[PDB]
Write a protein that binds this ligand. Sequence first.
Ligand SMILES: NC(=[NH2+])NCCC[C@@H]1NC(=O)[C@H]2CCCN2C1=O
Ligand SMILES: NC(=[NH2+])NCCC[C@@H]1NC(=O)[C@H]2CCCN2C1=O
Ligand SMILES: [Ca+2]
Ligand SMILES: [Ca+2]
Ligand SMILES: [Ca+2]
Ligand SMILES: [Ca+2]
Lengths: 198, 199
Amino acid sequence: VVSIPINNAGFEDPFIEVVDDYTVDTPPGWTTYNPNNLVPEKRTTWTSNNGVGYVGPGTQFYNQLAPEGRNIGYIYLAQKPGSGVAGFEQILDATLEPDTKYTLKVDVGNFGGEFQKISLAGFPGYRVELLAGDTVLAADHNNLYIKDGEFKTSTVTFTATPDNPYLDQKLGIRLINLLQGTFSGLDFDNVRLTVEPA
Amino acid sequence: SVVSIPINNAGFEDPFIEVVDDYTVDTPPGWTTYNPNNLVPEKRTTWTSNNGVGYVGPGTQFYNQLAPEGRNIGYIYLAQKPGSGVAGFEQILDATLEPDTKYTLKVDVGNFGGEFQKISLAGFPGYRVELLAGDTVLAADHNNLYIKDGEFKTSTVTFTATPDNPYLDQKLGIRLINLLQGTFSGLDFDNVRLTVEPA
Ligand SMILES: NC(=[NH2+])NCCC[C@@H]1NC(=O)[C@H]2CCCN2C1=O
Ligand SMILES: NC(=[NH2+])NCCC[C@@H]1NC(=O)[C@H]2CCCN2C1=O
Ligand SMILES: [Ca+2]
Ligand SMILES: [Ca+2]
Ligand SMILES: [Ca+2]
Ligand SMILES: [Ca+2]
């Protein structure tokens, strides 16, 4: 049960001082997964965007602290449900190796409360993907029910056989806002990828 | 408390098949062919991609067990190379999505093994089980179980519909997909069941 290295796996970079303050730029170590061009290259608050947010004691968004450290990673899409998807992506250095089971865990948060007097009730759905090259090997497409104000752990597993056509391609992770619901924002934290024999 | 949503030919029993490991190459009655990359032709043969039903009984070269339910399984076989697209079965149901309800979808997924005379059936394409309302995938199991040649495992997809869901009163739907992400590129499905449950 060795760990596979992921950059900024808990969105802890950058440091944020004030509770509930946030950035609006792609977190360092991740890129913006943008297959439908929903997220513009330059962002401000109230644009479709992603970034990190500080979920500290006293937070108005949850009934608990961050799953890990201070920060969560978030994705907010302004477009109406059905316009497409967006999220975060990271290609890893680890490659797909035969006779190995991979375990990917990430916590997913449905923030509640109010932003600028706008209700954050509701949820867009999520998908967590494990990749080799650009093939999605296994994914959790929105299986967990997650109430306003709480986080849950999504798990995705996959076993690579010596037959696998994608052996030796680089592993990837995607964390996606599905935009199938409003309020259309969600949080992610504490990305873990563990590898093991069979 | 927990009700069944009726599904046509939910265990692929129609039509009846008499001989061991025999199969049809036509879309199973009650089901549609889900064909977003045109991988499956309208008229099918041995030499092409196809789907249909197959009998799994004593004698079977494909499984270390008998069919999960009744006599038959439903199968999808794709002849194109890995990465070419996906195909599968789809069924639009009578029922529509209701608020404050929890849906559970279960299906047995089969990895047939065996060797048909120099052609090995070892290996597996990958599968996806989808629950739909309208044209929207609410929840899906994308290839999360590991299934050895010759065995079946049960996939479960669950979804809770809240009052604010944009998709209420849309017709529920099911898709069973061959991902074409490995060879040998066939897999089987059985015993499809969908239940509803006050949240
Ligand atoms: N989601 C968090 N944990 N923190 C809030 C980050 C702020 C983030 N960015 C925005 O521009 C606003 C607009 C409405 C919703 N937002 C957001 O979710
Ligand atoms: N899967 C079953 N139990 N039975 C039917 C399998 C038939 C399926 N379709 C075909 O045309 C044959 C050609 C060779 C491999 N085939 C298949 O895999
Ligand atoms: Ca964190
Ligand atoms: Ca919410
Ligand atoms: Ca059956
Ligand atoms: Ca097989």
